[PDB]
Amino acid sequence: AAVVVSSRWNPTPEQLRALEELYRRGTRTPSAEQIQQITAQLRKFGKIEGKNVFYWFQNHKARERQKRRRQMESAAAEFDSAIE
Amino acid sequence: VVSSRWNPTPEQLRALEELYRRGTRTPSAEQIQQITAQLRKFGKIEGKNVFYWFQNHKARERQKRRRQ
DNA sequence: GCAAATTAATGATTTATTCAAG
DNA sequence: CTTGAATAAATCATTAATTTGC
């Protein structure tokens, strides 16, 4: 019987899937009321607060950009090696 | 019995693994051809085998080791 | 011991995404 | 808004491990 305290919010798999689908529908920089409403809904899956949503979308946008940039340095790896 | 799908020779396997440990995870076309060149000393292999091996390895290590 | 049966691994294909040309 | 570039996720398919009954 015991406690564990978190230093960083982590999305539950359900909160994560919800945020990823908000992203697939085109959400990129939620407004303040958007942040609050999203938060109010995702709190049903578990712990989450407004700044967590705010950061999640910033970090996800940046990481997608960086990911997609580093997919470009590969320079058509799949076609040049697998199809021809 | 003859082969329909490639399978790494036990040495190509250790070399592909070493490359993954030292940071090669999403190799480029060029590098892929470089790697394929080297690994054929140890037997049959083509660029498609190398490209898929890194894709599948990376995906399934994510499955095993990533926490969510 | 040995293969047929069944299960686990993994190679190869397909599908759904992403950013950002145009 | 559309779509080119290029996956990585999900899935399909075949091989290797292994289990099983003899």
Residue numbers in the entry:
A (entry chain A): 89 to 172
B (entry chain B): 92 to 159
Sentences from the paper on this structure:
In plants, the WUSCHEL-related homeobox (WOX) family of transcription factors function as central organizers of several developmental programs ranging from embryo patterning to meristematic stem-cell maintenance through transcriptional activation and repression mechanisms. While the HD contacts DNA, the WUS box is essential for the recruitment of the TOPLESS (TPL) family of transcriptional co-repressors.
The structure of the complex was determined by single-wavelength anomalous dispersion using a SeMet-substituted crystal of the triple-mutant STF protein (L107M/L110M/L130M; see Section 2). There are two protein molecules and one DNA molecule in the asymmetric unit of the crystal. The overall structure of STF-HD adopts the canonical HD architecture comprised of a three-α-helical bundle core connected by well ordered loops and a long arm of peptide at the N-terminus, with overall dimensions of approximately 42 × 32 × 25 Å. The two protomers HDA and HDB are positioned more than 8 Å apart and are bound on the opposite sides of the DNA, making no direct protein–protein interactions with each other. The two crystallographic symmetry-related STF-HD molecules, HDA′ and HDB′, mainly contact the DNA in the minor grooves using polar and basic residues located in the C-terminal halves of their α3 helices.
